[PDB]
Every structure is written in structure tokens, then in C-alpha cells.
Structure 1
Amino acid sequence: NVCPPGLFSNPQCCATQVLGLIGLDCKVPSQNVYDGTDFRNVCAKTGAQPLCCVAPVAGQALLCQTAVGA
């Protein structure tokens, strides 16, 4: 609901993103997210960005797409 189905279906909060597709210092949101705006608000708590990644687990560098409505 906050991320599209398929490859980039895992929501994560990352310190930043490079090249338009790589999230850096990513972590699963600390709490549940229900929509684009809430997703963005949770990540902003730690100064992070909302991204939709290919992996369900935290990672220093993961392929991720920009979030929609975030």
C-alpha cells in the first residue's frame, strides 16, 4: 500500500539515495506505515527518506525506488 508490488515492494527508511536507485543506510521503519504521507513522516523522525527496496531486511546499500506520495 505504501510501495508497489513486485521487486521494489519493501518499505525502508534510508539516510539517502544515490543515482536514483540506490538507498544508503536503510532500515525497516520503526513502526507500521499505512500511507505515503505517514511513511514519509515516520522516516523524517530520524532524518531518513522513504524508499521502496528489493529487500525486506536492513542494509547499508540496497536497490530502492523513490516512494510515491511520500
Structure 2
Amino acid sequence: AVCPTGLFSNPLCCATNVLDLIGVDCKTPTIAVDTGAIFQAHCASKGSKPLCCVAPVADQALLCQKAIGTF
């Protein structure tokens, strides 16, 4: 899995991870992301970055972590 199970188990495409903890303008992937490369390429197509967050729904705010092996 691209995201660790538990707290940061939700893969989201976000503009940036403020202070490396707060995903901004996060959006749920529109295709299955089964590998880090696909995850990253898909988000990139949205001008975003692959982040693993606490919730599968982006309401703004939102605690996130960088997807392992990206950037």
C-alpha cells in the first residue's frame, strides 16, 4: 500500500503539506493508486503531490504525511 495503515492511511492529492503536517487543497485520487509512482504521477497530473492523511475526505485543515518515497 502507498499509505501506511492506521492514522495516515488515506491517500490524497494535495497542493502542499504545510509545515509537513497540514495538507492543503487535498483531493481524493480519481484512479486506483497501487504503487508510489502511479500515485505520484496521478497527483502530478493535478499539479499536486501524493500525501497520506488522517481522513479520506478533504475539508481543508487535515493532518497529512508525505507518501513514503516521494520527492
1:7 is displaced (CA, Å) by 0.2
Q: How far, CA to CA, are the matches of 2:59 and 2:26 in structure 1?
A: 5
Match for 1:29: what amino acid? P
For 1:17-32, list aligned pairs within 5 A: 17-32=17-32
Deviation at 1:8, TM superposition (A): 0.3
1:1-70 alignment, distance < 5 Å: 1-70=1-70
Given the two structures, how large is their TM-score scaled by the length of structure 1?
Answer: 0.93
Q: Is the 8 A contact 1:27 1:59 kept in 2?
A: no
TM-score by length of 2: 0.92
CA–CA distance in structure 2, aligned partners of residues 59 and 32 of structure 1: 21
* Unpaired stretches in structure 1, ≥5 consecutive residues: none
The alignment-based identity, stated in percent, is: 64
Greater than 6 Å deviation, 4+ residue runs: none
Name the aligned partner's letter for residue 6 of structure 1.
G
| Residue 56 of structure 1: how far off its partner (Å) | 1.1
Report how many residues are paired.
70
More strand by share: 1
